Tab-separated table of C-alpha atoms in Angstrom:
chain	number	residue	atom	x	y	z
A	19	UNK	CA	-199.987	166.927	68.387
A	20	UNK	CA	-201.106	164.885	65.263
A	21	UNK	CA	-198.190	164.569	62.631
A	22	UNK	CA	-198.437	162.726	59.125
A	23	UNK	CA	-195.947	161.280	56.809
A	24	UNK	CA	-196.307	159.493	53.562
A	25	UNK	CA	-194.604	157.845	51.078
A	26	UNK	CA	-193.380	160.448	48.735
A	27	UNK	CA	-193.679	158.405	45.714
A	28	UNK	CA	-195.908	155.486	45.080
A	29	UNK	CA	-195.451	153.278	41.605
A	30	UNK	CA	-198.035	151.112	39.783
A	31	UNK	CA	-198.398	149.603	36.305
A	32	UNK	CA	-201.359	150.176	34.571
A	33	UNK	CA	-204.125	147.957	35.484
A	34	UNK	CA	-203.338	147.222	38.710
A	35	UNK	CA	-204.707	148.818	42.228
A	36	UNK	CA	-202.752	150.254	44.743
A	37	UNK	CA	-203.670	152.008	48.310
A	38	UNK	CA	-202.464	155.337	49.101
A	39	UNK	CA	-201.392	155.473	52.973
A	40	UNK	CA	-202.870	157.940	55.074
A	41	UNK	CA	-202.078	156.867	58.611
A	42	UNK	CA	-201.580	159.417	61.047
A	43	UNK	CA	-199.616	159.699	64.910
A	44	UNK	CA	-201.158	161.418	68.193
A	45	UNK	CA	-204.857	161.514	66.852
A	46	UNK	CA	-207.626	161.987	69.860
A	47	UNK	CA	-210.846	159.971	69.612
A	48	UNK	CA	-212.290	161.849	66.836
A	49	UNK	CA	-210.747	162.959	63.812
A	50	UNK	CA	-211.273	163.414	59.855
A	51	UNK	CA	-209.071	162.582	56.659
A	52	UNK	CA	-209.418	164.419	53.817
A	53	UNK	CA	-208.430	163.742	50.044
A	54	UNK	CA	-207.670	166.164	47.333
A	55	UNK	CA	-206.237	166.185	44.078
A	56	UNK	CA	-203.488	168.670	43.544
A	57	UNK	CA	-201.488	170.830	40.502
A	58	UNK	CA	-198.968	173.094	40.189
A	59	UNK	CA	-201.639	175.821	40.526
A	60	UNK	CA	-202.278	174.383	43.852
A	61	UNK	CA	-205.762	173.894	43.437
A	62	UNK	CA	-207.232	171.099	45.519
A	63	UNK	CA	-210.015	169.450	44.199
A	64	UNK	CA	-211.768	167.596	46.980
A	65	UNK	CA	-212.027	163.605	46.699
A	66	UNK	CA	-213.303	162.428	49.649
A	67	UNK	CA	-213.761	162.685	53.528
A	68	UNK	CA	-213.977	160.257	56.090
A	69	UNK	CA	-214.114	161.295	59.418
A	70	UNK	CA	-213.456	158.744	62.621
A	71	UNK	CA	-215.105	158.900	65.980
A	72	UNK	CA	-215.021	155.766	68.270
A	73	UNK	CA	-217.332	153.407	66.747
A	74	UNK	CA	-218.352	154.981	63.936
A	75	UNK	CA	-216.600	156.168	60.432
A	76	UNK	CA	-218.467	158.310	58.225
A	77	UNK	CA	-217.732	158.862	54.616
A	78	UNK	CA	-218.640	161.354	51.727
A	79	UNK	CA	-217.395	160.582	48.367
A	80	UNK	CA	-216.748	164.032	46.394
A	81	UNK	CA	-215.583	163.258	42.419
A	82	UNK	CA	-217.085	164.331	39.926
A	83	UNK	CA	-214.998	164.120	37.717
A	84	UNK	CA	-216.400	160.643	36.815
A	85	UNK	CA	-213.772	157.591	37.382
A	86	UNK	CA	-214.173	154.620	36.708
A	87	UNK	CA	-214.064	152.673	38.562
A	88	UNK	CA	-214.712	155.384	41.238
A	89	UNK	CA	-212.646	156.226	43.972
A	90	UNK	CA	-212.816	154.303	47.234
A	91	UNK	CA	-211.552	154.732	50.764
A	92	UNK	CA	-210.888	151.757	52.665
A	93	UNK	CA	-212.095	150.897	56.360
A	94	UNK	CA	-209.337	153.188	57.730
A	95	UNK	CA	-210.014	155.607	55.103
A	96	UNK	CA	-207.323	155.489	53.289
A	97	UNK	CA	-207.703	156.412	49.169
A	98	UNK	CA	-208.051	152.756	47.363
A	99	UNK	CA	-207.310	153.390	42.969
A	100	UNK	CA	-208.676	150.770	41.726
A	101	UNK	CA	-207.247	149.371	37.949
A	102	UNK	CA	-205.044	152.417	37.862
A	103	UNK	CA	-204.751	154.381	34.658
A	104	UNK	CA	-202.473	157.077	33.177
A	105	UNK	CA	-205.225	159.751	34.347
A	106	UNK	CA	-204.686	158.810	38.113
A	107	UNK	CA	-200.517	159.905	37.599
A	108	UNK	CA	-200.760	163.118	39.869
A	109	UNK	CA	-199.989	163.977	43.227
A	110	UNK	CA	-202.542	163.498	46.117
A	111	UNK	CA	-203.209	165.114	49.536
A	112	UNK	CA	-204.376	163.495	52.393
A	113	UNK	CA	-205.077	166.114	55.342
A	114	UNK	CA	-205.854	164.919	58.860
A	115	UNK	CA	-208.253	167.158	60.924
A	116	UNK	CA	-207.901	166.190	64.779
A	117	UNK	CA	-209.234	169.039	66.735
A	118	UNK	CA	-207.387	170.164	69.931
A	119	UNK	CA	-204.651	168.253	68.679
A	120	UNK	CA	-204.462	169.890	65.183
A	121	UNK	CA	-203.986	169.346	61.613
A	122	UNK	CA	-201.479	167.783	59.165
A	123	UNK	CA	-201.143	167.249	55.631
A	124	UNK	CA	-198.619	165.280	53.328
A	125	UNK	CA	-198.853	164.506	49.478
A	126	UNK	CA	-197.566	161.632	47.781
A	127	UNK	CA	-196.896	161.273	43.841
A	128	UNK	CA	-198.562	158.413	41.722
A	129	UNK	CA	-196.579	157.189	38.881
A	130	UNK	CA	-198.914	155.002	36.822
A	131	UNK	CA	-196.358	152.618	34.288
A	132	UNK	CA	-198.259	151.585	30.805
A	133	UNK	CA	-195.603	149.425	28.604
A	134	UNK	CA	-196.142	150.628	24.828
A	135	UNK	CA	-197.143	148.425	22.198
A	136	UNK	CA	-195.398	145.963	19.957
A	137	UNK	CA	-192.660	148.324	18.368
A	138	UNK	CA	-193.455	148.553	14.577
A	139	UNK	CA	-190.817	149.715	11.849
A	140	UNK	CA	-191.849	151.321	8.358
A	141	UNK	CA	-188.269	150.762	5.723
A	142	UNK	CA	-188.139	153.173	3.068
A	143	UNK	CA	-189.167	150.607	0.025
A	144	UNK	CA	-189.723	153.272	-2.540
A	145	UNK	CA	-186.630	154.942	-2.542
A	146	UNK	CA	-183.245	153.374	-1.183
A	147	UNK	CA	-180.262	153.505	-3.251
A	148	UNK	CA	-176.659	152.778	-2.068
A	149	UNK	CA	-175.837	155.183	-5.174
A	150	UNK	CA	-177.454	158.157	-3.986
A	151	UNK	CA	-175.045	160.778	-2.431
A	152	UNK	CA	-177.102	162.180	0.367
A	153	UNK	CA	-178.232	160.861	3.913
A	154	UNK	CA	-181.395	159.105	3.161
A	155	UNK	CA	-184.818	158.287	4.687
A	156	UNK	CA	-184.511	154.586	6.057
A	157	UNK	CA	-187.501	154.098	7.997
A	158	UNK	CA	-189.480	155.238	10.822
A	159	UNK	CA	-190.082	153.196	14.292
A	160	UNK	CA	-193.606	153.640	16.322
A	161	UNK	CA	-193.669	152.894	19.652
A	162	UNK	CA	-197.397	153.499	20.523
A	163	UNK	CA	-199.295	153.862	23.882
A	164	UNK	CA	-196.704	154.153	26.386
A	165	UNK	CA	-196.439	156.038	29.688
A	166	UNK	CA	-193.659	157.413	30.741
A	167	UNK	CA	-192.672	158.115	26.980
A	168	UNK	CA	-190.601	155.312	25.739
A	169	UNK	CA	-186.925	156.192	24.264
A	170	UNK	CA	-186.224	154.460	20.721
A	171	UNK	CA	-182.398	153.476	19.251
A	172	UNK	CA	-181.816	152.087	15.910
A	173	UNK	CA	-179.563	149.109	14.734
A	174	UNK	CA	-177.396	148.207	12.054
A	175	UNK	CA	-175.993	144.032	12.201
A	176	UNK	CA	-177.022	143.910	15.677
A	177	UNK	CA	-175.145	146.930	16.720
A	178	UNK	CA	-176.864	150.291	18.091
A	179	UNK	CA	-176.500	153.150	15.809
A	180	UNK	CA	-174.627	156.056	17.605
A	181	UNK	CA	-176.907	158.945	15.630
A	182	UNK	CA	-177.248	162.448	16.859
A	183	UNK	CA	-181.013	164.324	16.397
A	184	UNK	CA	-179.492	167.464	14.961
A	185	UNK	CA	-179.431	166.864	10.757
A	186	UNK	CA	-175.867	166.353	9.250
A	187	UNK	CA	-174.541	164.490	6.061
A	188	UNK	CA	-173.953	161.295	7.880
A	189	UNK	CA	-176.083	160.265	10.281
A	190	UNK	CA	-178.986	161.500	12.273
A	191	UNK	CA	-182.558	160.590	14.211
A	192	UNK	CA	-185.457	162.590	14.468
A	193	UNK	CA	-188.077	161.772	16.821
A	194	UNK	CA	-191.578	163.528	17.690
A	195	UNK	CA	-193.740	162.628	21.145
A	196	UNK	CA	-197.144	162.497	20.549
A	197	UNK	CA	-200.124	162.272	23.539
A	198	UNK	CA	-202.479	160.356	22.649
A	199	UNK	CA	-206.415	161.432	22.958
A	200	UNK	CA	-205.816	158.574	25.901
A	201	UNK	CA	-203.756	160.521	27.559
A	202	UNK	CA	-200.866	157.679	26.941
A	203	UNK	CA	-198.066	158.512	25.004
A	204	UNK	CA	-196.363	157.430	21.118
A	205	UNK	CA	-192.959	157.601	20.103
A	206	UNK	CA	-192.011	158.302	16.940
A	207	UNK	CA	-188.838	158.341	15.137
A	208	UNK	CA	-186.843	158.220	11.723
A	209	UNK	CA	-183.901	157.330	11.004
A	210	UNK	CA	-181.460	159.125	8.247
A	211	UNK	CA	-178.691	157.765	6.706
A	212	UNK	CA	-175.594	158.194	4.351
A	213	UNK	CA	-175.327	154.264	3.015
A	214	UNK	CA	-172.766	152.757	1.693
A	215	UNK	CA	-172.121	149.672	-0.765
A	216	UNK	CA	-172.095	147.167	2.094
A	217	UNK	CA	-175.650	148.501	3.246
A	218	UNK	CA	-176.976	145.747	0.951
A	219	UNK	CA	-176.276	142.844	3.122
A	220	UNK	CA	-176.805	144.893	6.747
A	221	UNK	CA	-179.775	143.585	8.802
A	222	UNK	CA	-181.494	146.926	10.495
A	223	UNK	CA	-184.135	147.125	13.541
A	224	UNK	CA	-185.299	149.415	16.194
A	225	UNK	CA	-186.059	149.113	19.660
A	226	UNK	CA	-188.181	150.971	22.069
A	227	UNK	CA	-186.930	151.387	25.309
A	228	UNK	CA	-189.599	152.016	28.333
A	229	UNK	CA	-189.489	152.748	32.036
A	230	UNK	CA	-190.479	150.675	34.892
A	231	UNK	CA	-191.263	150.799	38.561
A	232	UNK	CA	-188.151	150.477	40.777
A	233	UNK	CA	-186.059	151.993	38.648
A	234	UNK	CA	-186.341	148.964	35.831
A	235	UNK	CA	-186.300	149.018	32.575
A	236	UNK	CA	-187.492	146.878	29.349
A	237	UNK	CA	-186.975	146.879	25.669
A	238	UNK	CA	-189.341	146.122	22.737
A	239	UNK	CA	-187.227	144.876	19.000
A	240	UNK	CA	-189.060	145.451	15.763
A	241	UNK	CA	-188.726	143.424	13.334
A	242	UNK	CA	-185.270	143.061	11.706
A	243	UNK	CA	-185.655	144.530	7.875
A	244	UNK	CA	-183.024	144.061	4.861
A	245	UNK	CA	-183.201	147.541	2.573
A	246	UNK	CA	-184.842	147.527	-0.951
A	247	UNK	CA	-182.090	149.186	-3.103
A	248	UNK	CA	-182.470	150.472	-6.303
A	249	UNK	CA	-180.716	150.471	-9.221
């Protein structure tokens, strides 16, 4: 009987092309391959077909949709993404119809990797003061353009600020997520503090943290920033 298996999970960085397997076992002369999209509705919006007999293969494209570049199958009609984009992070089907000797299907997920942008930092210029008794509004850290969403930490002398999101007197974070009308996603977050005299000579910075394929990992710095204080 036919039987297909896939790589579960395929990983690519934005940009870059990748081909999505679709080789099945104990096919007969003739047989077709079919593509589809799917969600968690289950919905399986067709992408192409390509069916295989002897000499000939025969293909019908189906998008539409719109890529670009399109879709492509290659000679063995397998699904070819070509300069992948954070649009084409979904799960695909490839179903193998092989007459007497059956069907199969098996889906694989895409995970399409963008690194975000230079990290930008915003200090507080206007209002800083190591006299004020309250945990103050130091700056806010953009990490733009990213997919997955990056993760940002803030610094004080080189050492990473251990801040909790929920407000307090002392210390805290706040972050939002943002998708962009890309479909890419921005980080951003601001950081509150209770200062103290020695603030005046600190250095400060943030750094967004992104995901990778295999499991890797980068970091982008901002800029290091001394506060304005006022007296």
């Amino acid at each position: 009987e036919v039987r297909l298996s896939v790589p579960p999970l395929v990983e690519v960085m934005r940009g870059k092309s990748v081909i999505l397997d679709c080789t099945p076992t104990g096919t007969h002369d003739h047989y077709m391959l079919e593509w589809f999209l799917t969600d968690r509705s289950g919905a399986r919006p067709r992408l192409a077909s390509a069916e295989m007999q002897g000499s000939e293969l025969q293909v019908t494209m189906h998008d539409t949709r719109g890529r670009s570049p399109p879709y492509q199958l290659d000679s063995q009609g397998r699904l070819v993404l070509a300069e992948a984009q954070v649009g084409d992070e979904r799960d695909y089907v490839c179903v193998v119809r092989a007459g007497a000797a059956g069907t199969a299907e098996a889906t694989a997920r895409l995970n399409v990797f963008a690194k975000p942008e230079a990290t930008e930092v915003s200090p507080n210029k206007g209002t800083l003061s190591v006299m004020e008794d309250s945990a103050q509004e130091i700056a806010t850290c953009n990490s733009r353009n990213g997919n997955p969403a990056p993760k940002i930490t803030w610094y004080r002398n080189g050492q990473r600020l251990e801040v909790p999101v929920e407000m307090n007197p002392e210390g805290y974070m706040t972050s939002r997520t943002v998708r962009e009308a890309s479909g890419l996603l921005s980080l951003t977050s601001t950081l509150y503090l209770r200062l103290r005299k020695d603030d005046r000579d600190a250095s400060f910075h943030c750094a967004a943290h992104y995901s990778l394929p295999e499991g890797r990992h980068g970091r982008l710095d901002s800029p290091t920033f001394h506060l304005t204080l006022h007296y």
